[PDB]
A paper describes a structure:
Caenorhabditis elegans encodes 16 different sHsps, among them Hsp17, which is evolutionarily distinct from other sHsps in the nematode. Consistent with its presence under nonstress conditions, and in contrast to many other sHsps, we determined that Hsp17 is a mono-disperse, permanently active chaperone in vitro, which interacts with hundreds of different C. elegans proteins under physiological conditions.
To address the basis for the special chaperone mechanism of Hsp17, we solved the structure of the Hsp17 wt 24-mer by cryo-EM. The edges of the cube are represented by ACD dimers resulting in a 24-mer structure. In line with findings on other sHsps, the overall resolution of the EM reconstitution is 6.49 Å with the different parts of Hsp17 differing in resolution. The NTRs of the surface-facing monomers are oriented to the outside of the oligomer and are partly unresolved, whereas the NTRs of the inward-facing monomers protrude towards the inside of the oligomer and interact with each other.
Author numbering:
A (entry chain A), B (entry chain A), E (entry chain A), F (entry chain A), H (entry chain A), I (entry chain A): 1 to 148
C (entry chain B), D (entry chain B), G (entry chain B): 1 to 124
């Protein structure tokens, strides 16, 4: 995924129906064999930490870790984003990376409406809106994954 | 899926093992090329809103949107079900549809035990039981998706 | 039209209908007709525009409130204009049954002057 | 022409020929010529019409009686008009050898005013 | 048929058994894509009309029409041979041809023994023998068509 | 034949030349496996019997029998149309049908010019023109069947 | 431009460049722009013509002599004109950096009069 | 040639024997579809003109023309290198290029021993040695071209 | 080559890239199996001998011999064009042909600038320009043959 024309469905001119439709887990494939490179090409990992009276948005570059290798937990009033991947063999050699992050949390932040999104280039953004609207009510619905 | 005999596993007589087992994301495929048609054949979108002293069940017809295009959020004490899909090309032309819904919420409704289900025909039902039992305790377990 | 508003106890609307319903399109060298069912939008809430030689059909109405929860309809339908279509004079009709018909007769009813009969008809 | 009538003892006609004989069609961006052999039909029996932006060539004559059995010729030939063809001024020629030539020069002899030389030629 | 070596069975050296044995309906195939051409190369359509005291033979060139497009009927003491074909698309364009023929009939001609034959080159000959022999008796037998 | 797009040549977009060109004997194929159905969808079998001073046309619905199973004979001044087919196995079971018809004949009807035609939907029409023109002369010509 | 002439001891020219260098062409229903790098030809030595509804770009200069051996540049570049392109008003621009931009905006900014609102809008 | 790994034999790891061994006429193939580019990446066309008492070497960049499109002739005491190619269609459009060169010749230069070579990158070098050795004698031998 | 559409590259619509690109050595292939024929269809072999004060052009029809079978040498002030081919087997039989030519040479003709060309139809033309310009200088460059 995100490597050529036949990935990245439905933008797939070689049939458009069933040939090369797959999940986005193959985003790191171009970087799997690429070693002399940076954190998926951005400056730093945590792009910004916005903490004001109207929003709370934090953007993290996670292009070097697959979404399966990325997990977020909250331990003792700290926003912890930790991503560990096994040793990966490339055209150059073998590399294992591991990062642990912790972030303080402002008072009055409700975690029941915090939404986190991953962009195509490999940036995970955690967005929160301050205490002006919304209620802790949440009604989820079934979402069918896009296999092929 | 839900289009012929070889979809809808395990009801698949042409091998029964590994040939045509796929996720339910292809439910809208018969309606993908069908335009002169209705909201997946039901009367209206929201089938019913049950609000009594024993249950709270709301059924919504979502047959015109894929489960990936359906998302539910709660904003300022309102049950909001919003589903947006990109323009879809069929045998007739191009159509883009978008619906936004909001619903008031009765007092004393706990969102921690509200369960939403999607039926085969494309109906999303949000069910809630009144304040007589259950506790906010929830113990989830890993569920492996059914790919093939 | 105005039947979106009575959504109380009538969450299935008065008439079941989905945004972006159309009947048929006839495309040939004689005519170009586009019939669209717009029964769920008021006459003043229907907008049709042609941008970059392409027909755009959009129907949107204000969110109609009721006892339980307000409902809104909004869709954008796009039809490609074939070659020779002149947006400056595209015909349009809205029947009383909620069907909007967009026609185009190509204005090709001219009598052919070129009638070779005897010798060197030429041109003009 | 008039040689269809002498069919007595001459069932093979004076000149063997089949309805719908043509020589060549030249289709390019400069000209559009259609040459058709119409030697078996009288000049007043040849009709050429353009319907729905398409060229129609039809040749029919009255059944020419003779000693044994009358003979008639009737055919309808259809040629599609390419893009940019204007039926209102389509050229046509009928040579003396029974060949009908339908021409179209596209009227594209205009001099291009857009001659960029020094700076910001723009338009008009 | 009548276009190359592999047609025209049994004169078919590439197997001789079952490969390219077909009916003679493909006689016009060489002329299907050939437009700048004549009535299948003969002078005129009706080759000759023989009307004497011993025979009645009329030969008609029907090479421009398939045998399926050729039909013969008798209307009001006239031998009518009419052949109409739909518009045919070739390498040059589209052509539709139609011919109607009528022929007077000598007195004393019995139609019960008139035989019409089609030659390979596309000539239909109607042969009749004068009133000297034969009887109106006719005993037909089953003829199996030669498919392959 | 008369079942999908690849039958019914030359209306055959998948090659247009030699792939799926076949005789019209497969007209009953859609009804071969269809049992809960009518006489090929018309009201009755004999559509009409026209008997006037200018024409004699009789239309018979024969959609339930193949043309090979349909045969017409005249016995003792009666127009007899009889069609018998063997037992046919479908998705439902086994059925054998047989019909025998007889029709009186008006005086002065010449059988030498009576033409019978079968339409695509399976209707056999017997047409006759009254005694005002035509002669018993008939000149047949060879017609090549359309195999492929 | 005039830097072709100093070819003495400078056989690699002042700026390396090949005849027929262009930047980008944008082809859509809104605009048709053709940008060509013509830095190696003088403004008076650049000729652009449209023949048979097709854009021709040619750049040729006189052979520029020097101490050792004269050098000349001559090329003919051909661009096909898409459908709807009017050569009589084709835009053209020549930037100061030796880039010649040939534009075409399609003149499709007309306001669509066909606005169906209530009943039988028809045409005109 | 000079585009990937399987060209440029014998440096061809995918078999090494007979698969992708071809002549060097495909040197311009990478530049065939490349238009926004320079004279095969060098500064100018004629790299240098060496004219001294010991050698006469002139290097010309001919990377934009195939060796078949390059021809050298001498007209009236001038070294003329002229290369014309037909219009070439690329991913961008159509381009036709033509160059004519003329070069003066020092006195005492014998053309019988002048050797011209083409390098891999597309540079044609004309080398001459001054009047100190060699004789006009030349004994050529048969050279078999390397096809595959 | 010069026999159908798939030869004569790049005029090759069936792929245009690598399928049927070959050298022009197959020019005689149509005449290889053709015997009842002439010297590749021209009148005579030597078309003309131009000998004036401005040019010296001689055109020879060599369509009956392959370029490999054609060799030109000069022996004792005579232009000799000799072409010998082995016995060739065709649909008719076996034929061996051999021709020897000699031509006188005008005084003052420099052979260092004489150019000979072979046309597509099989005509070899030897062209010479009189003593008004050019010098015996000749600078050749490498030309890659066009294999495929």
């Amino acid at each position: 995924m995100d490597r050529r024309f036949p990935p990245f469905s439905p933008f797939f001119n070689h049939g458009r129906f069933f040939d090369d439709v797959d999940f986005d887990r193959h985003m790191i494939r171009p970087y799997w064999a690429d070693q002399t490179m940076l954190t998926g090409h951005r400056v730093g990992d945590a792009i910004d930490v916005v903490n004001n009276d109207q929003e709370y948005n934090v953007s993290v570059d996670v292009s070097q870790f697959e979404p399966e290798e990325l997990k977020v937990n909250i331990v003792d009033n700290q926003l912890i984003i930790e991503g560990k991947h096994n040793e990966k063999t490339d055209k150059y050699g073998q590399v294992e990376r591991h990062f642990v992050r912790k972030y303080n949390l402002p008072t009055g932040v409700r975690p029941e409406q915090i939404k986190s999104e991953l962009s195509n280039n490999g940036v995970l953004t955690v967005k929160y809106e301050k205490n002006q609207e919304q209620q802790p009510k949440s009604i989820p619905i079934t979402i069918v994954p896009k296999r092929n």
